[PDB]
Amino acid sequence: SLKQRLKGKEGRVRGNLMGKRVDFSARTVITPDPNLSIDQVGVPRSIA
Amino acid sequence: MNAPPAFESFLLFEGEKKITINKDTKVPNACLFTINKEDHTLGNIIKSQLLKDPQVLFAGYKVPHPLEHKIIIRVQTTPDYSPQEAFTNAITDLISELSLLEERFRVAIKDKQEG
Amino acid sequence: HIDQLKEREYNNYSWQDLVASGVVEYIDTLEEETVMLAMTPDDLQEKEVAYCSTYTHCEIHPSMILGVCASIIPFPDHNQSPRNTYQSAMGKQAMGVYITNFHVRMDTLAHVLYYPQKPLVTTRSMEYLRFRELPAGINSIVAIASYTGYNQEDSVIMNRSAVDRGFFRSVFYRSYKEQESKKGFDQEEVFEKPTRETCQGMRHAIYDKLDDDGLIAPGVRVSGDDVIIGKTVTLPRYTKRDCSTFLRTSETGIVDQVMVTLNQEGYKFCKIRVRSVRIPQIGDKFASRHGQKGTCGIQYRQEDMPFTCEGITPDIIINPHAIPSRMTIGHLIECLQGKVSANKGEIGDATPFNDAVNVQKISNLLSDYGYHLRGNEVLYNGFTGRKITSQIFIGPTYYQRLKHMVDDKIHSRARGPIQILNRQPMEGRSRDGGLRFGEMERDCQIAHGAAQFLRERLFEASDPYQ
Amino acid sequence: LSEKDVDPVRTTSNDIVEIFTVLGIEAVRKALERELYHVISFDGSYVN
Amino acid sequence: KPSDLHLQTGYKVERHMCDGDIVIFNRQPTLHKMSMMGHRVRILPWSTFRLNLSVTTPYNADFDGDEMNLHLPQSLETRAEIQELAMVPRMIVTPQSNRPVMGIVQDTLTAVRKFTKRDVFLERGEVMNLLMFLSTWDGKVPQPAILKPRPLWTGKQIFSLIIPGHINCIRTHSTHPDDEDSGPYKHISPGDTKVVVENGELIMGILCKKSLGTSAGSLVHISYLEMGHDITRLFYSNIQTVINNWLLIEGHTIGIGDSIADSKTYQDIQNTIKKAKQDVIEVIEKAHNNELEPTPGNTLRQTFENQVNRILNDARDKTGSSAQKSLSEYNNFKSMVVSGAKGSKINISQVIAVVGQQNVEGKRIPFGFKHRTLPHFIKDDYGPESRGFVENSYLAGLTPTEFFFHAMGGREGLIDTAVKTAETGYIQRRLI
Amino acid sequence: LNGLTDRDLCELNECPLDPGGYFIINGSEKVLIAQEKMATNTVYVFAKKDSKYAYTGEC
Amino acid sequence: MIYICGECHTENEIKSRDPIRCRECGYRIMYKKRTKRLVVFDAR
Amino acid sequence: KRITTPYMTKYERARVLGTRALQIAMCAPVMVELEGETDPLLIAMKELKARKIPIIIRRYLPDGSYEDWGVDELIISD
Amino acid sequence: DREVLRVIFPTGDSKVVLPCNLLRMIWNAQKIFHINPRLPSDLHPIKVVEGVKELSKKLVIVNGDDPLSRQAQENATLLFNIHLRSTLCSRRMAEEFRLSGEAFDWLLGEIESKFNQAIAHPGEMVGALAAQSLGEPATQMKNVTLGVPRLKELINISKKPKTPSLTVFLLGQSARDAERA
Amino acid sequence: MIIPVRCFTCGKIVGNKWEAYLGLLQAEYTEGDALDALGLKRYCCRRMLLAHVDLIEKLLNYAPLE
Amino acid sequence: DEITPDLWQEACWIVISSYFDEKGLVRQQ
Amino acid sequence: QARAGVSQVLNRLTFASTLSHLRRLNSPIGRDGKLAKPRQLHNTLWGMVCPAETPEGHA
Amino acid sequence: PYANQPTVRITELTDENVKFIIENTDLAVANSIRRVFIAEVPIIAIDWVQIDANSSVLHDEFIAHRLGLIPLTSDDIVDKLQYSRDCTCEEFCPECSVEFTLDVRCNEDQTRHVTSRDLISNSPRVIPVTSRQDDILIVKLRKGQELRLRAYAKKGFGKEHAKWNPTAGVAFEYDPDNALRHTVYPKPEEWPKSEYSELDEDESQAPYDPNGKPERFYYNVESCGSLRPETIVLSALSGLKKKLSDLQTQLSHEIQSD
RNA sequence: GAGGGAACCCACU
Lengths: 48, 115, 466, 48, 432, 59, 44, 78, 181, 66, 29, 59, 258
Ligand SMILES: [Mg+2]
Ligand SMILES: [Zn+2]
Ligand SMILES: [Zn+2]
Ligand SMILES: [Zn+2]
Fold this sequence. Notes:
13 chains, H: Eukaryotic RPB6 RNA polymerase subunit, M: alpha+beta, RNA Polymerase Alpha Subunit, Chain A, domain 2, 10 strands, binds magnesium ion, RNA-binding, DNA binding (chain M)
């Protein structure tokens, strides 16, 4: 129903207005790198 | 997927300089030799052969990142000497060392084989 | 009874004869609450305060308290119990040879290790789980050392030369199924090679890798935008439209096998198995048999790895800091026992509750072979050749390659597909989706004060509208 | 609190509703502060 | 077609993400505001997100298979807001506990404990190699702490070169004696356990978690509050690089030889366990012969259980203290514990001496059968080995009853994590 | 595959180390996970907490 | 084109809309033949 | 008659730098001389250091009133 | 100020949380200006008194000259002004810290600049910051209840605590001897 | 499934040594004596033969499809 | 005769091997 | 309104995973339950249920 | 000029290893020589596989990997061979590569062992090492299975792939008496003595040498068979010298250019 | 140069 469309964390408000899928985002496994500074992230060439 | 080709650790691509020199402006008579597509082998021997030189005040090398293939050798010498000349003399001494070691190894193999 | 059970294949004496002799009996939980168990027959033979003289039953062996995936843990009574739980979880994720006839099967997902080895350090329960016959892992020369910092926070450093020699190399087999189907004579799907000027709505890809039956052939390189099954459905000048089966994106491979048959209702049905060789990589997940999971942080070549006086370089270097809070002492004992096992030429026994095997006995055995008795070795720095001041614990430990490669997990989106209903990015990397910038992320960006970044994530990088 | 020889100044409860009904709203503000601080700093952890 | 490749002023070019691009980097669950921080992009030739090790503490990240999210700000507005608001150096000190969130961790911590000890002397080549990894170095090699017979620098000299500006700080090492501040050697520490940094120079003391970690008043905290986020970022990176490259010389391991105790210590632990078990038997005889006097506020079960648990906890504490006093200075368990990098003295006690009592719901192992914990015991057995006291260590190996009771104990922690996640998340959402 | 030797199974392209114990439904191997339940026909007496009944027998 | 029968190893000739069945033994599962395209493996 | 803080807040500084950088990227005139820098963030940052950003921050008081502060009027303390 | 402190802190706990670290600032001034503690100093005590007065004037949290604004300013910086007058005692600056005149002027400037950096920025979303600062430690969390369930009983205002309790304190001799208690 | 050509750790040839190892084990050698006879002296090379499972012997019991 | 303590590990693993020869591992299904 | 997950796709990643799946027991109480008692390792599980092998998280 | 004067003492020279000692040289030179042993000695190994038929139970990439790990005799032919990147031919030629072919059909009821003896090279100087001990097993075929393939082997060193590593084990050691205390034993009596140790049974360590430096280095270079071990060491010295000469040439150009 | 949903299961941190 419409209430089931609107209610819950998978509903419209919580699942599509408070938070949503975004463009220009990546996700992958993290590995250490002691040779990077603290403000620096190593990025794969395919993601970039 | 993001795996680099295995020849990229030792092959210079087009437009890549092998060795570049930069003057280190912090202290006088200091230079940064950036050598591309080399690793701890040449960096270590050049570092130690520079350490044998008494006119060399500082000698060191680093790999800035092990996933890149680059050696930074910083050489600081006395004001009556040059870091470029120190680097050249170190490579010349290492070449003479390896020639002498090669001829003695050949003599030793010949002596071992003849009995 | 034991002398009769040494010859099952001769005397036809079996376990059922042992039950019929009144020697063993099956006790369930509600009956077990009235029996009096001796853990060992050492309890039956007793003196002083015998504790009990009315034992009614005896354990056959206490290592039978463990299940299938906990029976491959060597020295599980030397580990913290959550680590035994974690290894019981990760033993189901380990690459080996999952079944012998894997070439016949076309499973949707399959992972086959090149060179599975039986463990040097085994439990006796492994002889009944067929881990000697379908092993999942390789005995790796593991050094427990801090080397360059790339093994910190549950990471490993691998030998790149070993990886070049086939160390933990595996195969990923992926099967795709498709079938013709007439949804009435109106639709009538067919496996045929599509033509540019004939079919409606192609995906701008190539079809020349297909054979004339609409199917690709075994032995053909394939990539993400490559069609493996060409299926067309007639539209009731473009008489038919394209519904071809594509290869999944970013995973290259080779068509290993193509199989054609008829389904239950008699339509042509094709299963295509695609083979992709997975070489171990930075970010691939590797685990010991003691809950010591970890991703590969870096790979060094053999001339860069630390080496002993014999020139032995570790295949894997793990951090020392993975041990103390975890208290996986069975890992260290497995490594020591595996050094003894590889030197002696025997498969070490790591049955859980065994007084015949002790750390001092394994240490004396190791000292008998010209090594330090506690498993340490003088290692030299690979980069400079100098001796490492500390002496490194090193030896054979059985590692497993887990199913979780990074290349099956790396995902990035700039823009792409959106959902029909809310016009936001899709779900998952399989459909080129976006990542969720959920509620707690919104809370954090509120606390940061970044109002425009909150706006751009929640309005114009998801679903702008006027 | 009304009882003989009981301190009427420092005798307190851990019940928030009861302190609110007996002593007021600023008192239950302070009591709620004390209870939250006790919960947070039982582990030795510090929150500003 | 090349007329479409013409660029006019005012056009936009959607260029590929290059080096130095600002990104927001994120690990779920996003609990506090240092779970989404700004990073500068560096392209590296493999398929993972490469992250600095000090940064894993605010993210609550490790590398056992964690995946993380990278959001690219697509406008110069939010690029500047992330650059000036949410970068990693600006997020070093939290407003939650007015202390740093990122510290030195897990090889750099252990090797800065080992590196700043008094007896660490570096040759000229080692000092040159270490000063090569100092980015803030001014190019001047310091005068060595020893000039003759051989020029040797100490580790404190090189770390004084690491320490930025003119930071002034006084900390205590984790092995600092209690009575030393009253003794005659307060300002000349025999154990080198009082850290004094003066004018940005580590004058004395052994650095550890209490000096370089995430606590208030620590050296990274003072460095932040005095020098700012950029200088502190360089401080973190310089510590990690210099100490990690000295650790190639020094090396650090853990082995089965660090969990071995002395024969005398094994006899001491066995004697303590035997005496404590006999004391528990004596308390059981007192309660059985009705000679146990109940204490105020408790029933007879509660007094018996409290007294038995006090005896067993005293046994575990004494065996543990004997285990730590048995440890040498070369022990690696001790090396990671006194640095604060990993483990506690309880872990050393359990590995070396006694695992201890296994508890389910705060009490001993319950009578899951009819008045028995397992069918291998007699009925109404309240002794230590029946009700879950593991008298073996992890190196000795657990007996099958002890193994099962320890599994019962660890299942409690697994359950507590798995059922605390949802309630804590609901509490956070309601508070927000 | 009942009663077949390992040679007979290998001629059928079946693994002899395969345990069986599963079904093939539409080409998919399905395993029936065993399901726990309270034992039937046995009187169990519990104490319903926060209830108007103090003790409760159940069968 | 040429389809290997799963059972009897024979090479069957199958066209479009032809039922998938071995002529020699009537076995219902066919396999495509290896491609004649030349694929190159680096020995790495 | 201005009762708000005389210091530029970090949110004000972040948005001023973003707005100025976006204006420079849309070819606004540059208020200071630039020594071969191309990234608009660095140009906006050194206009902020030079106290030359031509932006007025309007701070809204909770009563509904406001105060207009020049960027050059606020203190660049951080 | 001492009596006001003992009213504020009746338990005698002297560990407080204050913006500027005055002891480390004095140490910094000693090290920067090469202050010799073994020599007489050229710092007048009246310079210390007047400098602390003017510094306390120029550390403003509540602006305004009306008596209500003045009272709010005196309240808002009360602990910091007490600590500032305690630490920059003319006796302590005379015989303990030994700072010179220029060191003292640098100290005043440093305290003022570091105090103005500590003031909360308008625009701080402090409620969400507080919610995260109280929810993130909850992830690492007489039969009294503690931890997560007690926090749940606190933020959800519960009429039925799991273990309600009183902490009864006694007056006079009834507190001292056991039998009257 | 088959004996690796090289030892993983060092690169010594262990591919030509599997059949000789099985023949020595058939000649009632112990595993250590058999590994000593083959010249496998480093334990990294000894584990390559000691821990090897020869799955190809069971893979060859299926009738070939191609 | 009684199984002596030195032969007990061999005896118990022989009877366990006999159990898993007869029953296997999926016998309940 | 029926039980779900009684029949599952058989795990074939490893032989150990197949064996572990074929000997799997399931308590059909809700995984959203925050009571520890059905999740605890009971004493009666000795020799009947593996004390180590259990999933992580809700189950 | 401050070059060393290193001396060589061969203590053992067999067909599969050489044990030697280098005195009066620096530790960095010794470690670089070991690193060039492992990484920068070029040999000839298969790097191009094209499989025409493969009916075996082992798939094509697996066979190609097993072929690439097979060592080929590279003595005196790898010196005159060219890298494919430096060759004037378009794809492959005899000046830069060696062509191998394999054609095995199993027709009998016994299992056929496709070994390295079935690798038929067109150049006689570059054959599998076991074709001059048993042969290196490539695959096993049952009746009806088949393996036809064509390979090209090219020059390369172990910095690219470990198949071009000529050494089995480069045992390297210095200061076997621990006189320099480069390693610190917690309990020195627990540690077995080195093969090159000069101590009696009672002692466990040499006395500390504050003036000492690493000066004597013990090698056991074991060959996988592609080159003779003395040829491995000589080609390593030549290759390290060639790398230093190339670096000095580029350094000379960079110095003159500025 | 992009055409499904829903339910359920398994797993990851
Ligand atoms: Mg993790
Ligand atoms: Zn047929
Ligand atoms: Zn080897
Ligand atoms: Zn050519």
